[PDB]
Amino acid sequence: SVSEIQLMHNLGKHLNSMERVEWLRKKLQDVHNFVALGA
C-alpha cells in the first residue's frame, strides 16, 4: 500500500512533511538576512 503518493509527487506544491520542512529551511536563511544575521 502507498500513502500520500500525490503529496510526495508535489515536492513543494503540497508542503506537509518533507515539502514543508524544505520551505521552513529556506525561511531560516530569509530570517538570517531579514533584520540581524544571527541564525
From Swiss-Prot:
Spans annotated as Important for receptor binding: 20-38
Mutagenesis or variant effect for W23A: Strongly reduced affinity for PTH1R
Compartment(s): Secreted
Effect on the protein of changing L28A: Strongly reduced affinity for PTH1R
Outcome recorded upon mutating R20A: Reduced affinity for PTH1R
Subunit structure: Interacts with PTH1R (via N-terminal extracellular domain).
Family membership: Belongs to the parathyroid hormone family.
Functional note: Parathyroid hormone elevates calcium level by dissolving the salts in bone and preventing their renal excretion. Acts by binding to its receptor, PTH1R, activating G protein-coupled receptor signaling. Stimulates [1-14C]-2-deoxy-D-glucose (2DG) transport and glycogen synthesis in osteoblastic cells.
Clinical note on disease: Hypoparathyroidism, familial isolated, 1: A form of hypoparathyroidism, a disorder characterized by hypocalcemia and hyperphosphatemia due to a deficiency of parathyroid hormone. Clinical features include seizures, tetany and cramps. FIH1 inheritance can be autosomal dominant or recessive.
Official protein name in the record: Parathyroid hormone
Species: Homo sapiens (Human)
Gene: PTH
